[PDB]
PDB file of all heavy atoms in Angstrom:
ATOM      1  N   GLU X 117      15.118  44.576   3.807  1.00118.12           N
ATOM      2  CA  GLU X 117      16.247  45.151   4.529  1.00118.12           C
ATOM      3  C   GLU X 117      17.534  44.351   4.350  1.00118.12           C
ATOM      4  O   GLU X 117      17.597  43.162   4.670  1.00118.12           O
ATOM      5  CB  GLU X 117      15.911  45.293   6.021  1.00118.12           C
ATOM      6  CG  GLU X 117      17.038  45.921   6.845  1.00118.12           C
ATOM      7  CD  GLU X 117      16.594  46.351   8.238  1.00118.12           C
ATOM      8  OE1 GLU X 117      15.908  47.392   8.353  1.00118.12           O
ATOM      9  OE2 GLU X 117      16.929  45.644   9.216  1.00118.12           O
ATOM     10  N   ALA X 118      18.556  45.029   3.833  1.00119.39           N
ATOM     11  CA  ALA X 118      19.860  44.427   3.579  1.00119.39           C
ATOM     12  C   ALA X 118      20.997  45.405   3.891  1.00119.39           C
ATOM     13  O   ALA X 118      20.806  46.623   3.882  1.00119.39           O
ATOM     14  CB  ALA X 118      19.945  43.973   2.124  1.00119.39           C
ATOM     15  N   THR X 119      22.179  44.859   4.164  1.00119.08           N
ATOM     16  CA  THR X 119      23.348  45.674   4.477  1.00119.08           C
ATOM     17  C   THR X 119      23.767  46.492   3.261  1.00119.08           C
ATOM     18  O   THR X 119      23.480  46.126   2.120  1.00119.08           O
ATOM     19  CB  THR X 119      24.558  44.810   4.901  1.00119.08           C
ATOM     20  OG1 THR X 119      25.018  44.047   3.779  1.00119.08           O
ATOM     21  CG2 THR X 119      24.177  43.871   6.032  1.00119.08           C
ATOM     22  N   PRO X 120      24.464  47.618   3.497  1.00120.81           N
ATOM     23  CA  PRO X 120      24.929  48.496   2.422  1.00120.81           C
ATOM     24  C   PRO X 120      25.706  47.735   1.347  1.00120.81           C
ATOM     25  O   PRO X 120      25.391  47.835   0.162  1.00120.81           O
ATOM     26  CB  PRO X 120      25.798  49.504   3.167  1.00120.81           C
ATOM     27  CG  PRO X 120      25.115  49.606   4.502  1.00120.81           C
ATOM     28  CD  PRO X 120      24.837  48.160   4.818  1.00120.81           C
ATOM     29  N   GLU X 121      26.717  46.978   1.771  1.00122.12           N
ATOM     30  CA  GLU X 121      27.541  46.201   0.846  1.00122.12           C
ATOM     31  C   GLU X 121      26.705  45.358  -0.111  1.00122.12           C
ATOM     32  O   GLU X 121      26.891  45.426  -1.328  1.00122.12           O
ATOM     33  CB  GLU X 121      28.511  45.290   1.612  1.00122.12           C
ATOM     34  CG  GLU X 121      27.937  44.675   2.877  1.00122.12           C
ATOM     35  CD  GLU X 121      28.281  45.482   4.120  1.00122.12           C
ATOM     36  OE1 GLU X 121      28.148  46.725   4.077  1.00122.12           O
ATOM     37  OE2 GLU X 121      28.677  44.876   5.141  1.00122.12           O
ATOM     38  N   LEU X 122      25.788  44.561   0.434  1.00120.26           N
ATOM     39  CA  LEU X 122      24.933  43.719  -0.396  1.00120.26           C
ATOM     40  C   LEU X 122      24.132  44.590  -1.351  1.00120.26           C
ATOM     41  O   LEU X 122      23.903  44.222  -2.504  1.00120.26           O
ATOM     42  CB  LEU X 122      23.972  42.898   0.468  1.00120.26           C
ATOM     43  CG  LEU X 122      22.917  42.110  -0.317  1.00120.26           C
ATOM     44  CD1 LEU X 122      23.588  41.099  -1.236  1.00120.26           C
ATOM     45  CD2 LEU X 122      21.985  41.417   0.654  1.00120.26           C
ATOM     46  N   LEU X 123      23.707  45.746  -0.854  1.00116.55           N
ATOM     47  CA  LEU X 123      22.935  46.682  -1.655  1.00116.55           C
ATOM     48  C   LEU X 123      23.750  47.151  -2.859  1.00116.55           C
ATOM     49  O   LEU X 123      23.195  47.618  -3.855  1.00116.55           O
ATOM     50  CB  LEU X 123      22.511  47.876  -0.796  1.00116.55           C
ATOM     51  CG  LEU X 123      21.386  47.586   0.200  1.00116.55           C
ATOM     52  CD1 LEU X 123      21.235  48.733   1.178  1.00116.55           C
ATOM     53  CD2 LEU X 123      20.094  47.351  -0.566  1.00116.55           C
ATOM     54  N   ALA X 124      25.069  47.016  -2.762  1.00116.46           N
ATOM     55  CA  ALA X 124      25.958  47.420  -3.844  1.00116.46           C
ATOM     56  C   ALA X 124      25.972  46.366  -4.948  1.00116.46           C
ATOM     57  O   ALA X 124      25.737  46.672  -6.117  1.00116.46           O
ATOM     58  CB  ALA X 124      27.369  47.640  -3.306  1.00116.46           C
ATOM     59  N   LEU X 125      26.239  45.122  -4.566  1.00117.08           N
ATOM     60  CA  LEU X 125      26.296  44.019  -5.519  1.00117.08           C
ATOM     61  C   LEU X 125      25.063  43.986  -6.416  1.00117.08           C
ATOM     62  O   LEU X 125      25.137  43.578  -7.578  1.00117.08           O
ATOM     63  CB  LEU X 125      26.419  42.696  -4.772  1.00117.08           C
ATOM     64  CG  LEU X 125      27.521  42.645  -3.715  1.00117.08           C
ATOM     65  CD1 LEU X 125      27.428  41.330  -2.969  1.00117.08           C
ATOM     66  CD2 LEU X 125      28.884  42.803  -4.364  1.00117.08           C
ATOM     67  N   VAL X 126      23.929  44.411  -5.867  1.00112.21           N
ATOM     68  CA  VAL X 126      22.676  44.434  -6.615  1.00112.21           C
ATOM     69  C   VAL X 126      22.462  45.809  -7.243  1.00112.21           C
ATOM     70  O   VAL X 126      21.987  45.917  -8.378  1.00112.21           O
ATOM     71  CB  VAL X 126      21.465  44.094  -5.704  1.00112.21           C
ATOM     72  CG1 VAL X 126      21.551  42.649  -5.238  1.00112.21           C
ATOM     73  CG2 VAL X 126      21.437  45.028  -4.498  1.00112.21           C
ATOM     74  N   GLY X 127      22.822  46.852  -6.498  1.00112.51           N
ATOM     75  CA  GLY X 127      22.675  48.215  -6.980  1.00112.51           C
ATOM     76  C   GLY X 127      21.282  48.588  -7.442  1.00112.51           C
ATOM     77  O   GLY X 127      20.281  48.273  -6.794  1.00112.51           O
ATOM     78  N   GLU X 128      21.222  49.279  -8.575  1.00112.45           N
ATOM     79  CA  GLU X 128      19.946  49.715  -9.128  1.00112.45           C
ATOM     80  C   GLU X 128      19.183  48.484  -9.673  1.00112.45           C
ATOM     81  O   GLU X 128      19.821  47.450 -10.095  1.00112.45           O
ATOM     82  CB  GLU X 128      20.163  50.675 -10.284  1.00112.45           C
ATOM     83  CG  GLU X 128      18.871  51.050 -10.911  1.00112.45           C
ATOM     84  CD  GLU X 128      19.104  51.864 -12.251  1.00112.45           C
ATOM     85  OE1 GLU X 128      19.921  52.941 -12.195  1.00112.45           O
ATOM     86  OE2 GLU X 128      18.474  51.430 -13.376  1.00112.45           O
ATOM     87  N   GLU X 129      17.836  48.581  -9.667  1.00111.09           N
ATOM     88  CA  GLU X 129      17.011  47.457 -10.179  1.00111.09           C
ATOM     89  C   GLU X 129      17.075  46.261  -9.234  1.00111.09           C
ATOM     90  O   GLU X 129      16.333  45.301  -9.416  1.00111.09           O
ATOM     91  CB  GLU X 129      17.525  47.003 -11.584  1.00111.09           C
ATOM     92  CG  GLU X 129      16.395  46.154 -12.308  1.00111.09           C
ATOM     93  CD  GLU X 129      16.943  45.653 -13.720  1.00111.09           C
ATOM     94  OE1 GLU X 129      17.984  44.823 -13.689  1.00111.09           O
ATOM     95  OE2 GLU X 129      16.414  46.061 -14.767  1.00111.09           O
ATOM     96  N   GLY X 130      17.954  46.337  -8.239  1.00108.09           N
ATOM     97  CA  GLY X 130      18.083  45.253  -7.295  1.00108.09           C
ATOM     98  C   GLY X 130      17.911  45.719  -5.864  1.00108.09           C
ATOM     99  O   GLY X 130      18.175  44.962  -4.931  1.00108.09           O
ATOM    100  N   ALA X 131      17.477  46.960  -5.676  1.00105.58           N
ATOM    101  CA  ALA X 131      17.288  47.485  -4.327  1.00105.58           C
ATOM    102  C   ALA X 131      15.931  47.065  -3.769  1.00105.58           C
ATOM    103  O   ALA X 131      15.760  46.946  -2.557  1.00105.58           O
ATOM    104  CB  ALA X 131      17.410  49.000  -4.333  1.00105.58           C
ATOM    105  N   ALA X 132      14.972  46.835  -4.661  1.00105.31           N
ATOM    106  CA  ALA X 132      13.632  46.425  -4.260  1.00105.31           C
ATOM    107  C   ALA X 132      13.696  45.085  -3.544  1.00105.31           C
ATOM    108  O   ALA X 132      13.140  44.917  -2.458  1.00105.31           O
ATOM    109  CB  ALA X 132      12.733  46.316  -5.480  1.00105.31           C
ATOM    110  N   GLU X 133      14.386  44.137  -4.173  1.00110.03           N
ATOM    111  CA  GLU X 133      14.554  42.788  -3.639  1.00110.03           C
ATOM    112  C   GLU X 133      16.004  42.343  -3.820  1.00110.03           C
ATOM    113  O   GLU X 133      16.321  41.556  -4.712  1.00110.03           O
ATOM    114  CB  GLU X 133      13.615  41.830  -4.368  1.00110.03           C
ATOM    115  CG  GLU X 133      12.168  41.956  -3.939  1.00110.03           C
ATOM    116  CD  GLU X 133      11.226  41.192  -4.845  1.00110.03           C
ATOM    117  OE1 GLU X 133      11.567  41.017  -6.035  1.00110.03           O
ATOM    118  OE2 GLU X 133      10.142  40.778  -4.370  1.00110.03           O
ATOM    119  N   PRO X 134      16.904  42.843  -2.961  1.00107.95           N
ATOM    120  CA  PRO X 134      18.323  42.491  -3.045  1.00107.95           C
ATOM    121  C   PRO X 134      18.618  40.988  -3.064  1.00107.95           C
ATOM    122  O   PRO X 134      19.237  40.487  -4.006  1.00107.95           O
ATOM    123  CB  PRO X 134      18.931  43.218  -1.842  1.00107.95           C
ATOM    124  CG  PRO X 134      17.792  43.314  -0.876  1.00107.95           C
ATOM    125  CD  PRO X 134      16.630  43.656  -1.763  1.00107.95           C
ATOM    126  N   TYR X 135      18.171  40.269  -2.041  1.00112.08           N
ATOM    127  CA  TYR X 135      18.402  38.832  -1.970  1.00112.08           C
ATOM    128  C   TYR X 135      17.748  38.094  -3.130  1.00112.08           C
ATOM    129  O   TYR X 135      18.400  37.318  -3.825  1.00112.08           O
ATOM    130  CB  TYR X 135      17.860  38.275  -0.658  1.00112.08           C
ATOM    131  CG  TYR X 135      18.376  38.991   0.561  1.00112.08           C
ATOM    132  CD1 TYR X 135      17.661  40.042   1.130  1.00112.08           C
ATOM    133  CD2 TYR X 135      19.581  38.617   1.147  1.00112.08           C
ATOM    134  CE1 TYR X 135      18.133  40.700   2.260  1.00112.08           C
ATOM    135  CE2 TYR X 135      20.063  39.267   2.273  1.00112.08           C
ATOM    136  CZ  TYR X 135      19.335  40.305   2.827  1.00112.08           C
ATOM    137  OH  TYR X 135      19.798  40.935   3.957  1.00112.08           O
ATOM    138  N   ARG X 136      16.458  38.334  -3.332  1.00111.91           N
ATOM    139  CA  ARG X 136      15.719  37.682  -4.410  1.00111.91           C
ATOM    140  C   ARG X 136      16.400  37.958  -5.747  1.00111.91           C
ATOM    141  O   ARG X 136      16.255  37.190  -6.700  1.00111.91           O
ATOM    142  CB  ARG X 136      14.269  38.185  -4.440  1.00111.91           C
ATOM    143  CG  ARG X 136      13.379  37.473  -5.447  1.00111.91           C
ATOM    144  CD  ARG X 136      12.199  36.797  -4.771  1.00111.91           C
ATOM    145  NE  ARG X 136      11.272  37.751  -4.174  1.00111.91           N
ATOM    146  CZ  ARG X 136      10.178  37.410  -3.497  1.00111.91           C
ATOM    147  NH1 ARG X 136       9.867  36.128  -3.324  1.00111.91           N
ATOM    148  NH2 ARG X 136       9.389  38.357  -2.997  1.00111.91           N
ATOM    149  N   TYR X 137      17.154  39.050  -5.807  1.00112.06           N
ATOM    150  CA  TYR X 137      17.852  39.421  -7.031  1.00112.06           C
ATOM    151  C   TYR X 137      19.000  38.465  -7.345  1.00112.06           C
ATOM    152  O   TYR X 137      18.977  37.759  -8.351  1.00112.06           O
ATOM    153  CB  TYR X 137      18.404  40.840  -6.919  1.00112.06           C
ATOM    154  CG  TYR X 137      19.004  41.336  -8.215  1.00112.06           C
ATOM    155  CD1 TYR X 137      18.340  41.137  -9.434  1.00112.06           C
ATOM    156  CD2 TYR X 137      20.239  41.986  -8.233  1.00112.06           C
ATOM    157  CE1 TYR X 137      18.897  41.571 -10.639  1.00112.06           C
ATOM    158  CE2 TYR X 137      20.806  42.422  -9.432  1.00112.06           C
ATOM    159  CZ  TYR X 137      20.130  42.209 -10.629  1.00112.06           C
ATOM    160  OH  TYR X 137      20.692  42.621 -11.816  1.00112.06           O
ATOM    161  N   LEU X 138      20.007  38.460  -6.477  1.00110.91           N
ATOM    162  CA  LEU X 138      21.169  37.599  -6.641  1.00110.91           C
ATOM    163  C   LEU X 138      20.801  36.142  -6.923  1.00110.91           C
ATOM    164  O   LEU X 138      21.413  35.496  -7.776  1.00110.91           O
ATOM    165  CB  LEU X 138      22.050  37.668  -5.391  1.00110.91           C
ATOM    166  CG  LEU X 138      22.884  38.937  -5.197  1.00110.91           C
ATOM    167  CD1 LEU X 138      23.565  38.925  -3.831  1.00110.91           C
ATOM    168  CD2 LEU X 138      23.918  39.022  -6.315  1.00110.91           C
ATOM    169  N   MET X 139      19.801  35.625  -6.215  1.00108.29           N
ATOM    170  CA  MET X 139      19.386  34.241  -6.403  1.00108.29           C
ATOM    171  C   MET X 139      18.838  33.971  -7.800  1.00108.29           C
ATOM    172  O   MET X 139      18.984  32.866  -8.324  1.00108.29           O
ATOM    173  CB  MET X 139      18.351  33.844  -5.349  1.00108.29           C
ATOM    174  CG  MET X 139      18.855  33.901  -3.908  1.00108.29           C
ATOM    175  SD  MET X 139      20.418  33.018  -3.620  1.00108.29           S
ATOM    176  CE  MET X 139      20.004  31.439  -4.289  1.00108.29           C
TER     177      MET X 139
END
Side-chain angles (χ1 to χ4, degrees):
Chain X
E117 181 167 284
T119 68
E121 38 265 45
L122 173 62
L123 286 169
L125 310 174
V126 293
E128 176 189 308
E129 198 182 63
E133 285 169 332
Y135 307 94
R136 185 120 66 182
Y137 186 45
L138 286 173
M139 298 309 307

